[PDB]
Amino acid sequence: GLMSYKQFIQELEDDILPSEAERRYQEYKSEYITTQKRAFFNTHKEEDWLKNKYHPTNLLSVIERRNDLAQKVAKDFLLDLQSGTLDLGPAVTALNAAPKAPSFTSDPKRILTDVEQTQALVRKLDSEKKIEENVLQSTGPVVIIRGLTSVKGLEGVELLDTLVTYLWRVHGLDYYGKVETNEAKGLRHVRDENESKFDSHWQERLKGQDPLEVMAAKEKIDAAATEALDPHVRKIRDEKYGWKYGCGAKGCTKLFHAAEFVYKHLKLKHTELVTELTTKVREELYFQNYLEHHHHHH
Ligand SMILES: [Zn+2]
């Protein structure tokens, strides 16, 4: 446990110095916390719970399970919409009292704004997750549901509630709660300072990328993995055909016409030479994600 200032002083009070004390306690604080965080990492670094949160390799398949689940859940969500069998309750999986939003949400003009943003988010996250067909994605937006038995038009609050629910059930995005988690649970939030940030939050979300995908940083990792392989790709001029690129592993004599071709070849015919050349970046990023994104109690 982190010593309060009061307690730290005591094993020094022999020849006291007020400002040497503050220097040392600050140092103590700094060193304690860095060390606790490493300790915790080293206790759990091996467990899958932690790896599924911060490790770039695991993340990739966390994303693939997420997407598959979502596609199937959207299929189902839309079926109940189509049959008028759908519930707009605040549960994550309903038929299977809630936290309230900052009351700037009472506003009926808010509704017109929320419908666009909401439909914008559904479009974004559907693309991210490869959900391809969705009816839910001058005037405000109108959606017509050609059902089994009969049609339903959706326009204002009803369209809004359908969309908000969709976001929560399929994408674990709690619109009114300004939060999205990978395996959301429980009840989503129902209906100046707050209002400018609310839009900002969701607007930058519309601009950026999937949080999980950002964690996973696959681009960054492929880049770093390719760089590590450079020493093992011989560049050679051909007498006629420009540059040919030769594989620099041992026992091996294969020749390729582009550099990407050698990289691809290396992680298929020299798996372990690659694994050995690329472990550090993966595991350093693992460590870095944990440090940045994990709530530590101190
Ligand atoms: Zn080779």
UniProtKB/Swiss-Prot annotation:
Zinc finger regions, C2H2-type: 245-270
Major location (coarse): nucleus
Location within or outside the cell: Nucleus; Nucleus speckle
Expression sites (tissue/organ): Expressed in shoot meristems and in emerging organ primordia throughout development.
Keywords of the record: Metal-binding, mRNA processing, mRNA splicing, Nucleus, Phosphoprotein, RNA-mediated gene silencing, Zinc, Zinc-finger
GO molecular function: DNA binding; DNA-binding transcription factor activity; zinc ion binding
Cellular component aspect of the GO annotation: nuclear cap binding complex; nuclear dicing body; nuclear speck; nucleolus; nucleus
Domain of life per record: Eukaryota
Loss of function: phenotype: Death during embryogenesis. Weaker mutants (se-1, se-2 and se-3) also exist. Mutant se-1 displays defects in shoot and leaf development. Mutants se-2 and se-3 show adaxial leaf curling, loss of asymmetric differentiation of abaxial and adaxial cell types and development of trumpet-shaped or radial leaves. Vascular polarity of se-3 leaves is also perturbed, with xylem elements forming both adaxially and abaxially in the vascular bundle.
One BP annotation, GO: regulation of meristem development
Residue stretches spanning the membrane: none
Family the entry assigns: Belongs to the ARS2 family.
Functional summary from the UniProt entry: Acts as a mediator between the cap-binding complex (CBC) and both the pre-mRNA splicing and primary microRNAs (miRNAs) processing machinery. Required for proper processing of primary miRNAs to miRNAs, thereby playing a role in RNA-mediated gene silencing (RNAi) by miRNAs. Does not participate in sense post-transcriptional gene silencing. Acts as a regulator of meristem activity and adaxial leaf fate via the miRNA gene-silencing pathway by regulating the expression of PHB and by limiting the competence of shoot tissue to respond to KNOX expression.
Oligomer status and interactors: Interacts with HYL1. Interacts with RCF3, RS40 and RS41.
Protein name, UniProt field: Serrate RNA effector molecule
Organism for this UniProt entry: Arabidopsis thaliana
Gene: SE
